[PDB]
């Protein structure tokens, strides 16, 4: 009936906001490492 004015059992908290905002980050970008197969690219 989408009219559930009943106060939520879990109220939104500020620390929750900052935590779930930070959660948007992931691991450091992983690039496929370059393979030095010969001497010139090593140089």
């Amino acid at each position: 009936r989408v009219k559930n004015k009943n106060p939520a059992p879990i109220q939104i908290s500020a620390e929750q906001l900052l935590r779930e905002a930070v959660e948007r980050q992931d691991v450091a970008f992983v690039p496929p490492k370059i393979n030095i197969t010969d001497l010139e690219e090593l140089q």
Partner: peptide, 24 residues
């Protein structure tokens, strides 16, 4: 010479390590 060579060999085995660790 040896440090360069060891770098080279590591590089081909890691280039082929993609096939080695393709499915794991």
């Amino acid at each position: 010479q040896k440090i360069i060579e060891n770098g080279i060999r590591n590089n081909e085995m890691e280039s082929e390590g993609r096939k080695f660790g393709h499915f794991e």
